[PDB]
Design a protein around this ligand. Structure first.
Ligand SMILES: [Zn+2]
Ligand SMILES: [Zn+2]
Lengths: 379, 379
């Protein structure tokens, strides 16, 4: 297996239960077990977890934010340093987003051509387009490349949703052709397209048909987790995911809380990313099977139990709630490091329980058991 | 008081009980409460406690090791950086030793002139003598200067003890004259002489007479804590301290354990220094009123009590034995920092209880109470 050839991108489904699937994506830099959670990476420095720590939590792939990497230190500099894998100290697969969401979310010109913007960090002028985004993701050397699309706001008028979806599909074809124009990228990386259409079923169908006609290695459901509430996100997923090709991975970008993930897998999603484990860890919040906890709470000052008494992570094998409480209350960076490591490992253990329960044909029961306990909050 | 003149060196005894004294040494950089414990300083870097942390433990004065400072970064470099107070970030009094003990303890030439040695750190050649030692301590800018003497080994033949004591007294006069030759040093610093004579009463008397004839600001009892055992050290102190001038401070160099300190104050010692609080802290050992403890012991893994339940230090206000146990077992530098801070603060609280009990005329009872509990070890 270590001495055997590695494919560019091969998705295999090993077991199904309803709309949920479990399987593997094989790529040249490693195997991704699905459903998969991708932690959001940053530069390999003393301020973040070590890459070996992130791998030991169970992560098979991480996400890079193209927009931030463009602004500092820049894509040309990362390429000169050997690419994102060398820059981040991570030798397994990396998915990069297109950079387009943070352009809107965080602007000199805007048209069907693409966008121009100035950096808040130094005032430098930057440009993004389907062609430029794919080029930058090539310079970063990422393994999964996201097509460049146009985000529709929330809430969105049906006219604005139609306009952004249609532009996104023209940009999806441009993304496809730019990716295919570069032999080194097309033979070694994969390209995902992004379905849009807001909450409107007919627009989602139009979008799915357009992406399937272009053809991609995987398909993301875009335009969700932007403030719509879980009920609505689930309702959109109910009809949107069946529209995508069944035999390719389905990616829900930027989701999310543990119960978001469970419900999305019930609806056919294979891949997830979120900053939540890290943001929560830095803020003194831990995920547990009994719901999130705020470790600063007085009730934890003498609690000798680990953050979660069923969590297998390296933190919970050693550190008590009481001592992580002490570290966080003192502002010691070790406290935030430990809670971040635990939160990412908890997410990976959630994904593993999901994969195991699908394989054993008991995922619907797992999801019900999970919700009953997570929302009772007997922590 | 803040707007009033400061004397070069003024020792006042406020209260006595038997041979024990409590009082103050006023100097230009601050007041030293006696009996005093001097922590042993190092360079103000990320590897040591912050100077403000050392001050907050209660220390009024710290000790600098002239030998180590000569070898790295060198006395001329420290002077160029503004002196030891600027180098160490410590603006209160500093006592420096002469460098002579580490010459023996850690050698190109040796005679009545002085010594020449090579540095293990770089092979550089270095020279020490009464004149050179005082000159180097002037470059360091220390407030209390130790005369340069010759250490007698332990055990020592009565002939070797006589020979080293007599050479030390000739060197004490040379130290006196070198110190007095430098107006800037003589007007702003103080000079201590060192009694020698090993375990032999007549040699100790000869030494005391010689030092009193020369005249010093304070008098150290040298040649102890070099392997002789507490009973013997106490026996030597019994007759040696009364030989020194009563109205000047008495300094027992390199002592020691808490029970060494208590017994030495019972015998007339006013000043102490030891690396023990730091060495123990780095090795996971804490001093307590119930004797030392090894925090790595399994019995502490769930112990929510502080290192010492009567200690007022900043560490014991916040951190449990259980969490310091966790930090030390993990090799986190914070663990060693906390135990070092607690150990130095414990030493200062020992000195404060000694001072208060002398002032109240209950020091003999304090010493008996202290020993009964420290040696019972009901920790
Ligand atoms: Zn954990
Ligand atoms: Zn303490």
């Amino acid at each position: 297996a270590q001495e055997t050839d590695r494919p560019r991108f091969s998705f295999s489904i090993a077991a199904r239960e309803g709309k949920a699937r479990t399987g593997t994506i094989e790529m040249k830099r490693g195997v991704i077990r699905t459903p998969a959670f991708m932690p959001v990476g940053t530069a390999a420095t003393v301020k973040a977890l070590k890459p070996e720590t992130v791998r030991a939590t169970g992560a098979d792939i991480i996400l890079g934010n193209t927009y931030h990497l463009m602004l500092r230190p820049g894509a040309e500099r990362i390429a000169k340093l050997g690419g994102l894998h060398s820059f981040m100290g991570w030798d397994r697969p990396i998915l990069t987003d297109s950079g387009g969401y943070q352009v809107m979310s965080l602007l000199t010109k805007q048209s069907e051509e693409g966008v121009t913007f100035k950096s808040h960090l130094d005032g430098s002028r930057h440009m993004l387009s389907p062609e430029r985004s794919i080029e930058i993701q090539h310079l970063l050397g990422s393994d999964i490349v996201m097509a460049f699309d146009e985000s529709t706001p929330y809430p969105a008028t049906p006219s604005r949703a139609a306009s952004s979806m249609e532009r996104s599909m023209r940009w999806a074809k441009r993304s496809r052709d730019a990716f295919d124009s570069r032999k080194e990228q097309a033979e070694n990386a994969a390209l995902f397209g992004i379905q849009q259409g807001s909450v409107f079923e007919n627009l989602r169908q139009q979008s799915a048909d357009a992406l399937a006609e272009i053809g991609f290695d995987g398909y993301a459901v875009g335009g969700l987790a932007v403030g719509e509430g879980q009920d609505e996100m689930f309702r959109v997923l109910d009809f949107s995911v069946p529209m995508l090709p069944d035999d390719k991975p389905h990616y829900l970008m930027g989701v999310g809380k543990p119960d978001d993930i469970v419900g999305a897998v019930e609806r056919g999603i294979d891949m997830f990313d979120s900053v939540l484990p890290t943001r929560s860890g830095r803020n003194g919040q831990a995920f547990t099977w009994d719901g999130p906890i705020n470790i600063r709470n007085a009730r934890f000052s003498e609690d000798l139990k680990p953050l979660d008494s069923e969590c297998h992570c390296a933190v919970c094998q050693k550190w008590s709630r009481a001592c992580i409480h002490a570290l966080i209350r003192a502002g010691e960076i070790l406290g935030a490091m430990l809670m971040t490591e635990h939160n990412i490992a908890f997410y990976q253990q959630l994904m593993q329980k999901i994969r195991d329960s699908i394989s054993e044909g008991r995922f619907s029961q797992f999801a019900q058991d999970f919700r009953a306990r997570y929302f009772a909050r007997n922590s």
